[PDB]
Design a protein around this nucleic acid. Structure first.
Ligand SMILES: [Mg+2]
Ligand SMILES: [Mg+2]
Ligand SMILES: [Mg+2]
Ligand SMILES: [Mg+2]
Lengths: 176, 177
DNA sequence: CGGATCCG
DNA sequence: CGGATCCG
């Protein structure tokens, strides 16, 4: 995939928001715009992007085997590089140029943890996770864990998660 | 994605590749020798249909690992790179108007028997062997035999010698399970 | 830092 | 079973 400007990425996401769907045992099921979250360097508002990252919120665990492996994009030329239930990397054609589109899935209960993970940047996550690891925790895209057991946090949004974990809330573009 | 191949098709592809593999080392084209190219995977196990072609490249110096697969060259053959690093490089190659997957792996000379053992498989066989060794506080991989994170210096050269030294019955590749 | 998908 | 490359 070629590199994109921030505005090019935003235009691609805008286009994709009404055109994502998946095939579920022969039935085309549309993915709702409210369940599509821009993540990665695009959410961090970086001037150039290596690719476009979208997080898809899947409402039922049983649908994970169907969503990314049978992903459909109305009107758009694409091919699949690698694809499973949780990550699907596509090469898309946008105005005669090839760009990389990375799709990820989260369940509703994972959403704040997934948004936190997929926003990055990697350096920031490593720091946060190292600090939590010193206190016998493990943070990932699915939850907060201690002794391989989910720590049930009373939170909904990414902001609530970050503050509950004991860190300073920063907007995506100021996380470093 | 790559299409499936017959055993003969795989063998023909390997035969062709044996004289045509090289790599670029700081602007210098260095040919890979046929003696340092080993057919591995399902091709070595003589399976009737193959999902891809697996080659193990024996690299004579540790310093070359950063150069070999990341600057791989194949004379005359159309290919593209899917994923690539120092130890694994997956290519899609064009062979008689069809696309196939070619998987290249690297081993150092001292790793050769271990690498051949690993890359021959099948997976079920390796899991069984490794589970048994794990019970005795060993760890076997493509690079060596280890105990307490330390290389167990075995006095062996070939894959057959390794298998017997590990305490297992030697079987030819096609009879491993 | 931690996991996904892939490699035998 | 154990590791590589790539994902944030
Ligand atoms: Mg990205
Ligand atoms: Mg991406
Ligand atoms: Mg193979
Ligand atoms: Mg292979």
């Amino acid at each position: 995939g070629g590199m994109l400007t921030l505005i090019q990425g935003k235009k691609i996401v805008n286009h994709l928001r009404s055109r994502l769907a998946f095939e579920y045992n022969g039935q085309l099921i549309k993915i709702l715009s409210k369940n599509i979250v821009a993540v990665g360097s695009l959410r961090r508002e970086e001037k150039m992007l290596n690719d476009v990252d979208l997080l898809i919120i899947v409402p039922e665990k049983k649908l994970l085997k169907h969503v990314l492996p049978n992903i459909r994009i109305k009107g758009l030329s694409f091919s699949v590089k690698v694809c499973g239930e949780r990550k699907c990397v596509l090469f898309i054609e946008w105005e005669k140029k090839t760009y990389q589109l990375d799709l990820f899935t989260a369940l509703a209960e994972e959403k704040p943890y997934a948004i936190f993970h997929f926003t990055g940047p990697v350096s920031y996550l490593i720091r946060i996770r190292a600090a939590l690891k010193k206190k016998n925790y493990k943070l990932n895209q699915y939850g907060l864990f201690k002794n391989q057991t989910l720590v049930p946090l009373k939170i909904t949004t990414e902001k609530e998660l970050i503050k509950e974990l004991g860190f300073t809330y920063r907007i995506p573009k100021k996380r470093l």
